[PDB]
Amino acid sequence: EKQLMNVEPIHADILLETYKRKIADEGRPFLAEFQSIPRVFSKFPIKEARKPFNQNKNRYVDILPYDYNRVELSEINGDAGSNYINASYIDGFKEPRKYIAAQGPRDETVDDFWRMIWEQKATVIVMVTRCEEGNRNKCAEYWPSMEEGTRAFGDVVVKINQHKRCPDYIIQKLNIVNKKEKATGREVTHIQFTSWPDHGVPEDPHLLLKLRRRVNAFSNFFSGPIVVHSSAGVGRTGTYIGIDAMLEGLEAENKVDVYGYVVKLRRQRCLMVQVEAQYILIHQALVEYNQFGETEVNLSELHPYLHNMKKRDPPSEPSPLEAEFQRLPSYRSWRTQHIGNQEENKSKNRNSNVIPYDYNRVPLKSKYINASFIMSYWKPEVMIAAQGPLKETIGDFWQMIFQRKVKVIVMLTELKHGDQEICAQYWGEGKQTYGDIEVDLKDTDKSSTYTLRVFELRHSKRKDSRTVYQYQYTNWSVEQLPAEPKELISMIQVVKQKLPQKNHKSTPLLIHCRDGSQQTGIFCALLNLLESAETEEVVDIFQVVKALRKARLGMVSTFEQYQFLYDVIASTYP
């Protein structure tokens, strides 16, 4: 072979830090570790992939399987070369042949692919790619559309039963059987991760840590291999295995020899983990699971988990939950926010140290307005979390709810406490007109809990008009947590039903309180935790707050609030 290196298996603790130095100056210590691991491995003979009757069976002449671990198909008599398919056995942290790393089937290979799944008794396919990327084919669609209901490739009959469609992955529940062979059908689980770019990396490591938690959860009735394929089967797939394995390896020895495990992989299939970015990714995955761990109760076991999470037997100490809140970062000066700190703009902030990050501040097609873009459960949908308008910005405010096409506004504050103004009053009884836009409220409905106001907006661009709803919530001073939650909830429902839900930076919702973080964070949270409690019966309060804390400063910056989420999410699900 060659002269690689000898890296020191990282121990749990120092992981966080090792990572830090390994990445200083655009991580050359990493670019080195990954640079030394050879593309292919000279020795290991690759004679069967190259054969002539198998040329068309490969997706890239660049990626061909070693001969000793190549997955084999029941040699069809006569038809020479029917034992070959582009796939390869891969070893985990122990289980030899735990996975099958395979090239995305070709339209001409689709039948040999479902043959491998039947002959290998695999009942867990993990697709980490998209059939179409950049207008080029990266993988044929080897499955029936929920419509066709059932399609049979060759002698293998595939029928889909369920089709769940989450934010990053789509989980399908199939039933396959060989009808030319009296034997009974098998339940297959197919996951497709769509938030992963070819040769690239996802957005947040937690996304990867995410589907891992969920493939480990799927049932493998035949102790068969786990099919992990992508386009060539080496890049994104190699990376996934990396994490899965190295995690076991951590949850096992509190150490991790990534370098080693990659080299070990690169010995079974060429170019596995094809990018420095994916290399650095695997580490981050470990550094973050290590750091914050697994925070994601299931609606099934919510009340149990939370109940003990809240108790601290030796009271001279905090509760486990408190532990959690403390592990939660607080990006204090996390990123650039100069825009918000200009001379004229410092008088455009109800609060000087609650300025939007330059990285997400709402442009004012550009001018300034203290409002932050917030990520929504369903990507790429986004909502604005701004501050109650200032007696002088009331004009800009409407420009924003008009330009970004807001449909519903949620005001969590009163117009003013005692004598001091907590917010201005962007609305009047008349036909208030701010700059190019003209508002005109048409209705004002007061309820024991909130108050709905229906405005009709326009410009000199008349004979059109957009109707804008505003829900103002009362029972909730910037202090006491929402008085009686059960109704805070009802609000969130009625509000939700007025916004569409069809899925152009045109954010439909807009939420605000004094600084747009104080109590606006609690809201945004609840929103996503609810939309997830519905679509997956699962809930990760920690991570949700971690992305908020990351979006604008000031949100859920107190244990009282953090814990609040837990409470409400729970009482509204027995």
The distance in angstroms from the start CA to the end CA of the chain is: 60
Supply the minimum distance, in Å, between the C-beta of residue 485 and another protein: 53
Q: Which is nearer to another protein, 106 or 514 (by Cβ)?
A: 106
Q: Is 164 in the site for another protein (CB under 8 A)?
A: no
C-alpha to C-alpha distance for 270 and 229, rounded to whole angstroms: 14
Q: Is 271 in the site for another protein (CB under 8 A)?
A: yes
Instruction: Give residue for tokens 């420009």.
Output: 399
- How is residue 467 written in tokens? 């109707």
Q: Is 274 in the site for another protein (CB under 8 A)?
A: yes
Which residues, in sequence order, are CB contacts of 248 under 8 Å at separation 6+?
A: 92, 93, 94
Binding another protein (rule: CB under 8 A), the pick from 60, 68, 221, 222 is 60
Binding another protein (rule: CB under 8 A), the pick from 122, 226, 232, 439 is 232
Residues in the chain: 574
Supply the minimum distance, in Å, between the C-beta of residue 346 and another protein: 49
Contact 512, 409 (CB under 8 A): yes
Q: Is 132 in the site for another protein (CB under 8 A)?
A: no
Supply the minimum distance, in Å, between the C-beta of residue 106 and another protein: 12
Supply the minimum distance, in Å, between the C-beta of residue 481 and another protein: 54
159 bridge partner residues = 150, 175
C-alpha to C-alpha distance for 247 and 108, rounded to whole angstroms: 36
Q: Is 62 in the site for another protein (CB under 8 A)?
A: yes
Q: Which stretch in 79-87, 227-235, 325-333, 445-453 sits in contact with another protein by CB under 8 A?
A: 227-235
Q: Is 37 in the site for another protein (CB under 8 A)?
A: no
Interactions with another protein, residue window 81-120 (CB under 8 A): none
Please name the residue ranges forming H helices in 390-503: 394-403, 485-496
Q: Which stretch in 54-62, 114-122, 203-211, 371-379 sits in contact with another protein by CB under 8 A?
A: 54-62
Which residues, in sequence order, are CB contacts of 269 under 8 Å at separation 6+?
A: 65, 66, 69, 88, 90, 101, 233, 234, 238
Q: Which stretch in 59-67, 332-340, 394-402, 435-443 sits in contact with another protein by CB under 8 A?
A: 59-67
Q: Is 207 in the site for another protein (CB under 8 A)?
A: no
Q: Which is nearer to another protein, 232 or 369 (by Cβ)?
A: 232
- The secondary structure of 339-405, three-state, reads HHHCCCHHHCCCCCCCCCCCCCECCCCCCCCCEEEEECCCCCCEEEEEECCCCCCHHHHHHHHHHCC
- How is residue 214 written in tokens? 């969920």
Supply the minimum distance, in Å, between the C-beta of residue 232 and another protein: 5
Binding another protein (rule: CB under 8 A), the pick from 15, 63, 208, 382 is 63
Please name the residue ranges forming H helices in 5-79: 15-35
- How is residue 111 written in tokens? 């039948």
- How is residue 382 written in tokens? 């986004």
C-alpha to C-alpha distance for 43 and 256, rounded to whole angstroms: 27
Supply the minimum distance, in Å, between the C-beta of residue 39 and another protein: 8
Supply the minimum distance, in Å, between the C-beta of residue 203 and another protein: 23
CB burial string 390-427: b at 16+ within 10 A, e below: beebbebbbbbbbebebbbbbbbbbeeeeeebbbbebb
Q: Which stretch in 57-65, 312-320, 371-379, 506-514 sits in contact with another protein by CB under 8 A?
A: 57-65
Three-class SS state of 561: helix
Supply the minimum distance, in Å, between the C-beta of residue 238 and another protein: 12
Q: Is 234 in the site for another protein (CB under 8 A)?
A: yes
Q: Which is nearer to another protein, 59 or 404 (by Cβ)?
A: 59
Q: Which is nearer to another protein, 39 or 505 (by Cβ)?
A: 39
For another protein, the binding residues (CB under 8 A) are 39, 59-63, 231-232, 234-235, 271, 274
